[PDB]
Design a protein around this nucleic acid. Structure first.
Length: 48
RNA sequence: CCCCCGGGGGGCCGGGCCACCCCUCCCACGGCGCGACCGCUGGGGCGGACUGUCCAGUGCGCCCCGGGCGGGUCGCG
């Protein structure tokens, strides 16, 4: 009751890094399918 | 006020403009050439992330570019 005022914590500038995983792009998403199919074949003639 | 045959015709002197040939402004429009500002799509380096049942591949960030493409705005010839 004698000091209800709130003093925010001082905001320090941060190193500005990224802990999260960025979203994959279309070119990458589309190229992975080409590798998955190609690797599925180049693994199939090894059995052949 | 004159002139040619009472009726038809011809002039009076100044000024500016267009006709032709010379020169030259600003503007409009179109064309050709050039330069500047924006847009789009090849290289290299750096940094980082990711993918692929062979070491290969794919964006993104920054920077430098040789460009290519195209239109707008601006400025010339």
């Amino acid at each position: 009751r004698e000091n209800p005022v709130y003093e925010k914590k001082p905001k320090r500038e941060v190193k500005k890094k990224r802990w999260n995983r960025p979203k994959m792009s279309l070119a990458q998403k589309k190229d992975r399918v080409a590798q998955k199919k190609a690797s599925f074949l180049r693994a199939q003639e090894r059995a052949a």
